[PDB]
């Protein structure tokens, strides 16, 4: 066992190995509290994450096992992975506090979106990392759900990182957010059996809004969310519509007055053309038809990045611990093993 050290950052205390210095806040929210620390050992600058709450209900404690499990999983440059994971707890049943370490990454993509109006070379390169992170993840059947600029973490050397890839339909008001700027249609329209494309639609929102400095669609409620997008890419074809069973839904954009799709050149004028052409394949209204990362990866645009010998997939991912209906206790002992069998990676 490591040894520890106490102490009380703004409202929340920290007990963390001595390797951990100079612990300094960072934010925090629903997810937990974040540091930046300098781990010692290995000379790096390193983020850790305070769990909030990690066993107040079978909801959180599912979601902490989940996210220790997404995060032991993933080994790739354009999405945040594990250094390391600690819980000063001596045993199971004074188990309560988890604490995750992963590289420190200094800004968001709002920070780089609002500081500076981003170079058509600075938008290929961040786009193109978004892909390439989200066909890693998406090779191992898992979906982001809620891609936007405050889960796109980018350095000072413009490298990207995804983050928060660790929530479902759940029944609790913490982390709610009132209409989401960059969430596919279908999602606005609550259909239960969207696929992996649902981040494609947000990859288009935020590489809009990269080059043109505007949120695309901002919508202040899921109906004028919806009714922004039908705006620019025009109301449901024949094919689409038949694909609603949702009554309600299919009457309701049925009875709006109906909208032609229109041309992306004239919306995202100045803008490069390759870029516009992707942005058209990204935002298609019929996920069915959206472009999907691998896809995305090849085109045109990122000729200067793309190489498919280093866009690489994802070993399996076991996700059936999903559909398990267990007790807090239960999931609780099982985050206490993935601590515990936990193997940093080599330096
Ligand atoms: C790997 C990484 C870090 C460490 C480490 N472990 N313990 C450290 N001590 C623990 C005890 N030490 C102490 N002990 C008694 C009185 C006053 N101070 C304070 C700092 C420092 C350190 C440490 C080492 C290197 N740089 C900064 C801190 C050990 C292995
Ligand atoms: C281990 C250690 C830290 C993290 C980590 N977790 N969450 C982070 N964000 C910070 C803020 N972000 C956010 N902010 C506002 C709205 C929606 N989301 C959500 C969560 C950043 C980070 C983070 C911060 C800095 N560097 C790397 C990661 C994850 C695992
Ligand atoms: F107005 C819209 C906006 C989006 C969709 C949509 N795109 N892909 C799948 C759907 C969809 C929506 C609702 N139910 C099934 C499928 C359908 C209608
Ligand atoms: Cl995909
Ligand atoms: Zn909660």
């Known amino acids: 066992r490591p040894t520890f050290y106490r102490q009380e950052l703004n409202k ?26 300098f781990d010692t050992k290995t000379g790096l600058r390193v983020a850790v994450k305070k769990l909030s709450r990690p066993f107040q209900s079978i909801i959180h404690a599912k979601r902490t096992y989940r996210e220790l499990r997404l995060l032991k999983h993933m080994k790739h440059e354009n999405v945040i992975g594990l250094l390391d994971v600690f819980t000063p ?42 892909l390439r992170g ?46 989401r700027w960059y969430r596919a249609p279908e999602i606005m329209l609550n259909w239960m059996h969207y696929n992996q494309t649902v981040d494609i639609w947000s990859v288009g929102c935020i590489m809009a809004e990269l080059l043109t400095g505007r949120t695309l669609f901002p919508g202040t409620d899921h109906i004028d969310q919806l009714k922004l997008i039908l705006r620019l890419v025009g109301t449901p074809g024949a094919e689409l519509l038949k694909k609603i069973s949702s009554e309600s839904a299919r009457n309701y954009i049925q009875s709006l007055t109906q909208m032609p799709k229109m041309n992306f050149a004239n919306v995202f004028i100045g803008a490069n053309p390759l870029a516009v052409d992707l942005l058209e394949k990204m935002l298609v209204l019929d996920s069915d038809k959206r472009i999907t ?7 045109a645009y990122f000729a200067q990045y793309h190489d498919p010998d280093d866009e690489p997939v994802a070993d399996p991912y076991d996700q059936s611990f999903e559909s398990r209906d267990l007790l807090i206790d ?3 002992s099982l985050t206490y093993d993935e601590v515990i069998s936990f193997v940093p990676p080599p330096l």
């Open 12 to 37: 929340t205390i920290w007990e963390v190995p001595e390797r951990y210095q100079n612990l300094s806040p960072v934010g925090s929210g629903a997810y937990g509290s974040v540091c930046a620390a």
């Open 293 to 299: 990362a691998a896809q995305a990866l090849a085109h």
């Open 134 to 179: 989200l066909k890693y993840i998406h090779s191992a059947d898992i979906i982001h759900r809620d891609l936007k600029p405050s889960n796109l973490a980018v350095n000072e050397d413009c490298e990207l990182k995804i983050l928060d890839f660790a929530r479902h339909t759940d029944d609790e008001m913490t982390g709610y957010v009132a209409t």
């Open 89 to 130: 707890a001596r045993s199971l049943e004074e188990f309560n506090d988890v604490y995750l370490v992963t590289h420190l990454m200094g800004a968001d993509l709002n920070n780089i979106v609002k500081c500076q109006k981003l170079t058509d070379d600075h938008v290929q390169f961040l786009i193109y990392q978004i």
């Open 330 to 332: 239960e999931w609780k």
